[PDB]
Design a protein around this ligand. Structure first.
Ligand code: HEM
Ligand code: HEM
Ligand SMILES: [Co+2]
Ligand SMILES: [Co+2]
Ligand SMILES: [Co+2]
Ligand SMILES: [Co+2]
Ligand SMILES: [O]
Ligand SMILES: [O]
Lengths: 153, 153
């Protein structure tokens, strides 16, 4: 993925977007629909629109523009924050501590054991299955960063 | 990936962890070191400690347990939050709206054009390359969720 640098560049231009999210939203959708008319056919509420002037006149196209860029902006902001939080952990475990993925499986199993032991009424089979999958996603995230740094975990 | 309920089951049990992070951190490391003694060799400060009674008496071990579960908790709670925004979007766009990944590539191109045209002083070649990579990461995350839902992309 991106550097801390790359993410700040993304978030900086996103700040400009957020100053006029409807204006940006409208332009993005008009640029999409004009460049790739087949995209417009996917929108039951917009596909009647036939001129640039009709698309600009649509109150709801502009509202939908806001909906799209608000959802995306949320996703980019969470991705930047989560990457910046994981990167350091991956880098120390990969470069100084050199913790294989097998060891991360071991501590994952230990966490599942302690939660089962301590919180049975908040950790029956479905909840334990949830946590098992969540810690696997965490290990996969570390693994992916391990390989970018060319460490064999 | 996790269902919406499974992520809440993760958050609910993690609340119980944070209520006594020191105790959980201790029990997790003791379970790791007693279940997998070879993992103890990684820790200069703990690698001499032979028994659970000794491990429980180690203020450094308990201190490290808090650090580990603090780091992991941050990552889990962020992933729970991010996924919960992302999964419904993927679910709606694969199943209800029927939007190919290729179309996500088209709206990404449109976002990059509108940013470059409106904010060139915030969208030089480095910033444009960052945003291009950021939107590819987004589409990759939607394509992963599609594939889980059995949608061809
Ligand atoms: C950056 C990419 C995209 C984002 C962030 C996004 C986000 C949204 C959101 C938040 C909604 C409303 C909630 C929902 O249905 O899930 C929505 C609805 C929808 N999106 Fe997307 N979308 C994107 C791309 C696309 C593309 C490329 C198309 C079509 C070619 C598309 C077609 C639709 C349709 C048809 C709806 C239903 C609209 C209605 O209410 O009539 N989306 N989108
Ligand atoms: C859930 C999994 C894990 C988390 C969240 C985690 C987190 C941390 C954190 C936050 C630190 C301190 C800052 C840093 O150096 O990055 C740390 C240090 C360390 N971790 Fe981990 N860790 C995990 C798994 C493991 C495992 C399985 C091992 C070894 C088997 C390991 C060995 C170490 C070592 C040796 C240090 C340095 C200890 C010191 O000098 O004080 N970690 N870890
Ligand atoms: Co959010
Ligand atoms: Co409960
Ligand atoms: Co955070
Ligand atoms: Co330029
Ligand atoms: O959309
Ligand atoms: O750790």
């Amino acid at each position: 993925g991106l550097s801390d640098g790359e993410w700040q560049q993304v978030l900086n231009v996103w700040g400009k977007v957020e100053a006029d999210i409807a204006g940006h939203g409208q332009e993005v959708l008009i640029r999409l629909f004009t460049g790739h008319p087949e995209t417009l056919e996917k929108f039951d509420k917009f596909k009647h629109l036939k001129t640039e002037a009709e698309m600009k006149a649509s109150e709801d196209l502009k509202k939908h523009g806001t909906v799209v860029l608000t959802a995306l902006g949320g996703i980019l902001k969470h991705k930047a924050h989560a990457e910046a939080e994981l990167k350091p952990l991956a880098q120390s475990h990969a470069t100084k501590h050199k913790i294989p993925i097998k060891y991360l499986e071991f501590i994952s199993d230990a966490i599942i054991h302690v939660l089962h032991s301590k919180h049975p009424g908040d950790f029956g089979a479905d909840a334990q299955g949830a946590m098992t999958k969540a810690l696997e996603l965490f290990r996969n995230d570390i693994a992916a960063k391990y390989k970018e740094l060319g460490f064999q975990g």
